[PDB]
Amino acid sequence: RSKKSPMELISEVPPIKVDGRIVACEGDTNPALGHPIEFICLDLNEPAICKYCGLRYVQDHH
Amino acid sequence: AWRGSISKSMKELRILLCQSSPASAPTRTFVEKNYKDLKSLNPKLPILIRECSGVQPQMWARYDMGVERCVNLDGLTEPQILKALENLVKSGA
Amino acid sequence: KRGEIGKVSGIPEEHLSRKVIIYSPARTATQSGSGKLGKWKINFVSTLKWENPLMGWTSTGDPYANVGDSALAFDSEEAAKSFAERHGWDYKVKKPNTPLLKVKSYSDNFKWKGNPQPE
Amino acid sequence: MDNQFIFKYSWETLPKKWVKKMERSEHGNRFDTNTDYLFQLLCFLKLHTYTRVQVLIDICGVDYPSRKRRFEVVYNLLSTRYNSRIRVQTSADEVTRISSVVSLFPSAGWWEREVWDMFGVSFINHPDLRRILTDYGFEGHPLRKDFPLSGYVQVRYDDPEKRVVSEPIEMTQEFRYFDFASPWE
Amino acid sequence: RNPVGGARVHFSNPEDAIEVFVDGYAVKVPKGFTVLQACEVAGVDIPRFCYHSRLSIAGNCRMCLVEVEKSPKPVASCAMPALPGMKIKTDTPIAKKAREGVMEFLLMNHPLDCPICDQGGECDLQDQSMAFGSDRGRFTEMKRSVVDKNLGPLVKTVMTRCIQCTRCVRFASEVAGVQDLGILGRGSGEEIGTYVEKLMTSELSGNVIDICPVGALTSKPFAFKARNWELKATETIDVSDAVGSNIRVDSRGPEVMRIIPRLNEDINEEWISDKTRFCYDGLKRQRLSDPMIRDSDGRFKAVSWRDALAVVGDIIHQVKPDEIVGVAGQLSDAESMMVLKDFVNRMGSDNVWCEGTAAGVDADLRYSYLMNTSISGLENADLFLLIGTQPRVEAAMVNARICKTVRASNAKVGYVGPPAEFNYDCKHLGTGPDTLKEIAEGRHPFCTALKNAKNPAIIVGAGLFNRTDKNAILSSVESIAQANNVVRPDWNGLNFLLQYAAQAAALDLGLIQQSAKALESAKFVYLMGADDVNVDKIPKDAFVVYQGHHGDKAVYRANVILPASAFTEKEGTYENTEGFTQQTVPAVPTVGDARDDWKIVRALSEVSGVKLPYNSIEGVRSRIKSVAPNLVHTDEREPAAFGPSLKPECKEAMSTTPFQTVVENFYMTNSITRASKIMAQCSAVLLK
Amino acid sequence: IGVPPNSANLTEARRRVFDFFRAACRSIPTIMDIYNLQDVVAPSQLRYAISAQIRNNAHITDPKVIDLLIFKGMEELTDIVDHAKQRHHIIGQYVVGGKTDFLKNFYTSNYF
Numbered sequence A: 001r002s003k004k005s006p007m008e009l010i011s012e013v014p015p016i017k018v019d020g021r022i023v024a025c026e027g028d029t030n031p032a033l034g035h036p037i038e039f040i041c042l043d044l045n046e047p048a049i050c051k052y053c054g055l056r057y058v059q060d061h062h
Numbered sequence B: 001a002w003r004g005s006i007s008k009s010m011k012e013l014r015i016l017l018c019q020s021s022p023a024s025a026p027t028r029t030f031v032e033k034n035y036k037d038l039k040s041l042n043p044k045l046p047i048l049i050r051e052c053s054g055v056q057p058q059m060w061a062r063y064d065m066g067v068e069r070c071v072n073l074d075g076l077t078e079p080q081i082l083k084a085l086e087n088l089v090k091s092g093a
Numbered sequence C: 001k002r003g004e005i006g007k008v009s010g011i012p013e014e015h016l017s018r019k020v021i022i023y024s025p026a027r028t029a030t031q032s033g034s035g036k037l038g039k040w041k042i043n044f045v046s047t048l049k050w051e052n053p054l055m056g057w058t059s060t061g062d063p064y065a066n067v068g069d070s071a072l073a074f075d076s077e078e079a080a081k082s083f084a085e086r087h088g089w090d091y092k093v094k095k096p097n098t099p100l101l102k103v104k105s106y107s108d109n110f111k112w113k114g115n116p117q118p119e
Numbered sequence D: 001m002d003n004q005f006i007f008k009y010s011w012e013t014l015p016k017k018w019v020k021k022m023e024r025s026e027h028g029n030r031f032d033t034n035t036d037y038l039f040q041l042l043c044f045l046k047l048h049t050y051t052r053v054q055v056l057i058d059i060c061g062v063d064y065p066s067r068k069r070r071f072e073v074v075y076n077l078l079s080t081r082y083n084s085r086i087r088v089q090t091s092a093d094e095v096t097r098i099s100s101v102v103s104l105f106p107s108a109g110w111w112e113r114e115v116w117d118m119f120g121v122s123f124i125n126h127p128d129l130r131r132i133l134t135d136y137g138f139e140g141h142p143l144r145k146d147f148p149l150s151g152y153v154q155v156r157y158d159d160p161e162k163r164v165v166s167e168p169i170e171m172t173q174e175f176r177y178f179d180f181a182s183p184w185e
Numbered sequence E: 001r002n003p004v005g006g007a008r009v010h011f012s013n014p015e016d017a018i019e020v021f022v023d024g025y026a027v028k029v030p031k032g033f034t035v036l037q038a039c040e041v042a043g044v045d046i047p048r049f050c051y052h053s054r055l056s057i058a059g060n061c062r063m064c065l066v067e068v069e070k071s072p073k074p075v076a077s078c079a080m081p082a083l084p085g086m087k088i089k090t091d092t093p094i095a096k097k098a099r100e101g102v103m104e105f106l107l108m109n110h111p112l113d114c115p116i117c118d119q120g121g122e123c124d125l126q127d128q129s130m131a132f133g134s135d136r137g138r139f140t141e142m143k144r145s146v147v148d149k150n151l152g153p154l155v156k157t158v159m160t161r162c163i164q165c166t167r168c169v170r171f172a173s174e175v176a177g178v179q180d181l182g183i184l185g186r187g188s189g190e191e192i193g194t195y196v197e198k199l200m201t202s203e204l205s206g207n208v209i210d211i212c213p214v215g216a217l218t219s220k221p222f223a224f225k226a227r228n229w230e231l232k233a234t235e236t237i238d239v240s241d242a243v244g245s246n247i248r249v250d251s252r253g254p255e256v257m258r259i260i261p262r263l264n265e266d267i268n269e270e271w272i273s274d275k276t277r278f279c280y281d282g283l284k285r286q287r288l289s290d291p292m293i294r295d296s297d298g299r300f301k302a303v304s305w306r307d308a309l310a311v312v313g314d315i316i317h318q319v320k321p322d323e324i325v326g327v328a329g330q331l332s333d334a335e336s337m338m339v340l341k342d343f344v345n346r347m348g349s350d351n352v353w354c355e356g357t358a359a360g361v362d363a364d365l366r367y368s369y370l371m372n373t374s375i376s377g378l379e380n381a382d383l384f385l386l387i388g389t390q391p392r393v394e395a396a397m398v399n400a401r402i403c404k405t406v407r408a409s410n411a412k413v414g415y416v417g418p419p420a421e422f423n424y425d426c427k428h429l430g431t432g433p434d435t436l437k438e439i440a441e442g443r444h445p446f447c448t449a450l451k452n453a454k455n456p457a458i459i460v461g462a463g464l465f466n467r468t469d470k471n472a473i474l475s476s477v478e479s480i481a482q483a484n485n486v487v488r489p490d491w492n493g494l495n496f497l498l499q500y501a502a503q504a505a506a507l508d509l510g511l512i513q514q515s516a517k518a519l520e521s522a523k524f525v526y527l528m529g530a531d532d533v534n535v536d537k538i539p540k541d542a543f544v545v546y547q548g549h550h551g552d553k554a555v556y557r558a559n560v561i562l563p564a565s566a567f568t569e570k571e572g573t574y575e576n577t578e579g580f581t582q583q584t585v586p587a588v589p590t591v592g593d594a595r596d597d598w599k600i601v602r603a604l605s606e607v608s609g610v611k612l613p614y615n616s617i618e619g620v621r622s623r624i625k626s627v628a629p630n631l632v633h634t635d636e637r638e639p640a641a642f643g644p645s646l647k648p649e650c651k652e653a654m655s656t657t658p659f660q661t662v663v664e665n666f667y668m669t670n671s672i673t674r675a676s677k678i679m680a681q682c683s684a685v686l687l688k
Numbered sequence F: 001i002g003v004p005p006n007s008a009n010l011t012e013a014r015r016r017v018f019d020f021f022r023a024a025c026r027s028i029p030t031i032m033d034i035y036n037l038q039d040v041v042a043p044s045q046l047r048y049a050i051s052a053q054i055r056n057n058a059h060i061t062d063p064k065v066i067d068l069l070i071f072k073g074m075e076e077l078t079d080i081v082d083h084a085k086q087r088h089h090i091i092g093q094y095v096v097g098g099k100t101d102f103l104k105n106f107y108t109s110n111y112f
């Protein structure tokens, strides 16, 4: 699947459901092998994008 | 009546001078007591008075095709400056 | 210009007739610090650059492309003028623009407007 | 033996008209002298019993374009007997000929040739003062602050001419100078 | 020792000058300076985050805390006034421990996104953290975060990096004049924003990118493009308007990356407009790069320089001398205008003029087209009378200084012109010439304030020069100026504000139109970068040559296209509205086969069998020295010599048509902005 | 042998210039044999070349600058005497050698 650019590949990952109003993204299961810690505020309607990973986080209930 | 045909022979009259000096003082007097009369008799001639700090008093004159004549007004009185202007007007064209 | 040092230096004659600008770089607008001030530089006006048509890199044919920005710096205007005079470079000096310290006090934020005027 | 002793001894024994600047620190005890007294000072410091400096470590130049006397010539010295180091400095511009010390230290020849090659400082009474490091026919002294990093000429093989030729320099990618200086220094 | 940054302290009198000890050093400062300013005089540079010399004092960040002997607690040096005999201490353990405490607090909720921050190598927070901060962080808990908000197409906003210095709020409230930004909320949850979804519509809105010490406010077009250490800084000036703001062009190779302001206390004062800041985009779009001549079918073929010059020199010899017209552009420098004037004069014609104010204006005395009161001198005025001018769109920095004078000295502004929007309170006296007659005769309530003002300032606009009743209006304004004293030896108030960068140099050099019906009876028109003229006036038989750097409507009618270099690619002299001559410094190489304007005109003269004595740029400046000798004495503050008394009496009648607006689109004025991509999304969402 | 002490007046500088010129002229026969310049150049064209260099460097009035120029010329002469430099180099340096200049430069490039 080399035809898919990294933009299209990161645009297909479903947003991660988070219960709270804020989530911390590190980029990997092991913190030392990822990107610097990024705290994301989930106080909007659109999914919130990590500025390192491109991963999207959305608030679960409210 | 040479003051009424300046526009017929000339096409531009530049009077360079300095505003803070004792050499351009007779040039400043000439500009003050003669600009309004010359500009009134010649409403279309562009009599340009440009001044700077380190500038020698001069009086330029463009003619029919780019021709220019200059007179150094550094040792002249006001009547002498007027007579020089007469020489540029009459003899020039 | 007594460019004798330029003749006994080794600079080629073509580069000894360059026109340079002696100036003091000013403080950047994105920072409030004033550490990179007071030094004078010689600007060679080296702009003849193009693009490598293999990788898009910036190519040049001017030896004085980065000298005045990288190595050649002076502590005063007189030093740069003397350097240019001895190297036979035609130079023009740009005097730096300096800030003026005006009177500012915190109490001016809170000043009486005046009696209500029904004008 | 030590920076505290060498400084005080040289303060007293040395003629005063030679040295004009004496820094005493842990970075190094320096002596700054005029160029017309350098040979005298180095001959005194090579023969005196309590200052037996018999090794010339190196001779280097430093370029200060903002000074009137542009070049600074530094003589790093070593005394094996007393286990101490002395540094002697002079200053010279581009058209002054300073005295050579090859008579005292035979090893000074190549360092003086390198200083002349790199900075353009000439030495009086040097047996042979020719360039030692730069290419044959090199024009300019590279270690000066006004000399461009990449130089003025470039070398390539010219097939029609059947020899290696020198041409004006033309970089495919210019040197990118990055200004990391901070305004809060 | 010298003040930090070469700051000049102006002592009004030697008597009012207190003495302080910054670090045991005797320092003399006037009464009114603060501890921070006194330290700045003594060479000591205090850390600061929320203090800006052009903004009101607000001791928020607590970073400039110093030690004072008669103080139990550290004092904020930005707000504490200096007292006689006060002993300041900056390098004591108290001041240090305060600084590493404040830095530790500031770097506690700050996001770990330096690598992706556009303020990476130019951030005040990390530069001061390295210098005045500590080494290890004791904070491990969860940080706070905020959502990002859209402030328009110019300012990119990442508010998680906000340090809450409120400098943007103070700038918007005081300097910009458009109150739309403020601190919302209470406590650690306080945020900077507009509350409602609105965009920054101020022409000086881009200056919040520079005043922000962190990467919270950054440029959106210049997002992630490059880092500051990759950029070569060239100190150049503006040609977008006639103010001539001092800018600093940063480039990475043969293209320009960004434009940021440059300090000039007399012209721009650390600020530039949004049209200045984001005009660099058009310098790389639709650029003419090759000489081109139309074909029989009507298409432009790329041709060499020799053949194009041959064609134009062959056609120039077939038209009558009075049939030749040369029109300069608004971006033209003085040398090219002098060369064009000489060329046209030698061919036998006298029709040379500029794009804008070139309807027959008399440039005979040099006070009638200049800001006879310096821009920095407008800060002493007590009453501004804006006759038919809108400085907000014409000269944005003059408007900024007028707003400064109004908000600080409580000055009064009276406006006579078409309806418009002002960022300061203004009284709409009228909308046409009749208002000037009403003011002149008297009994108008504004006339009382005008005659009871110590330093009135009348600012006439350049748009008042294309009217048919120009002489009558200029006589009414001069009558108002004489009756109500504004022009005295100790204060000159009569001002004329130009809109184009080339107008001042053109008027100094004598480039004034002679015949009104000159572009209708022409046969060879040399448009020297003049695309702001309506080409539909040009007859269909005329041979039009367009010599410029960008393609516009004039290109679609030109017969020969001669590519030119932009203002960032040449050495040229430009004159301000106030008569101040400055020079541009080349920053990037010219694109394609384009040449400097004066070179192209001189080569055309040579091919057309007309010899010009000069052959180099230094030869041109010697010729200029015999015409306008003040255009070669650059960086000199030469005041005007004579006054309005010399003008002959002109008894015309003022017309009845109301004044017009000269600038309709502020983001679409010159050809560079007209070809820019940023100025389109700015004129599409920011203009109402 | 050793580098001579720096001169004190212009007369000594002129004497050193003449001595260097004479040495260079005596070095001409050696170059014609070390490099195959026999059927290339007359034995006087090179002499004229050194004379032309001395003459276009003849506006110097500083004895130190003159001494440095002489020293550099002597270094160049010594290098040429040895086989250090390539053959075409001296033939590329030591050989004696219409509308408007401005218009040709304009046709060439914008950067004069």
Ligand SMILES: CCCCCCCCCCCC(=O)SCCNC(=O)CCNC(=O)[C@H](O)C(C)(C)COP(=O)(O)O
Residues within 6 Å of the ligand: F013, F014, F017, F024, F027, F031, F050, F053, F054, F055, F057, F058, F059, F060, F061, F066, F069, F070, F072, F073, F074, F076, F077, F080, F094
């Ligand atoms: C193959 C050979 C290799 C080496 C060839 C040589 C290469 C270097 C050429 C020399 C480079 C120099 O500039 S070294 C020589 C430069 N030094 C001077 O020119 C002194 C100033 N000139 C004068 O004083 C007078 O004009 C004077 C000309 C003396 C006579 O005129 P008078 O007496 O009436 O006064």
Ligand code: SF4
Residues within 6 Å of the ligand: E110, E111, E112, E113, E114, E115, E117, E118, E119, E120, E121, E123, E124, E125, E126, E161, E213, E214, E215, E216
């Ligand atoms: S604002 Fe400064 S400290 Fe904060 S992330 Fe950006 S560069 Fe780093």
Ligand code: SF4
Residues within 6 Å of the ligand: E161, E162, E163, E164, E165, E166, E167, E168, E169, E192, E211, E212, E213, E214, E216, E217
């Ligand atoms: S956005 Fe920038 S200027 Fe405004 S308060 Fe925050 S840090 Fe200060």
Ligand code: FES
Residues within 6 Å of the ligand: E047, E048, E049, E050, E051, E058, E059, E060, E061, E062, E063, E064, E065, E076, E077, E078, E079
């Ligand atoms: S700069 Fe003074 S408290 Fe912020």
Ligand SMILES: [Zn+2]
Residues within 6 Å of the ligand: A025, A026, A027, A035, A038, A050, A051, A052, A053, A054, A055
């Ligand atoms: Zn992430």
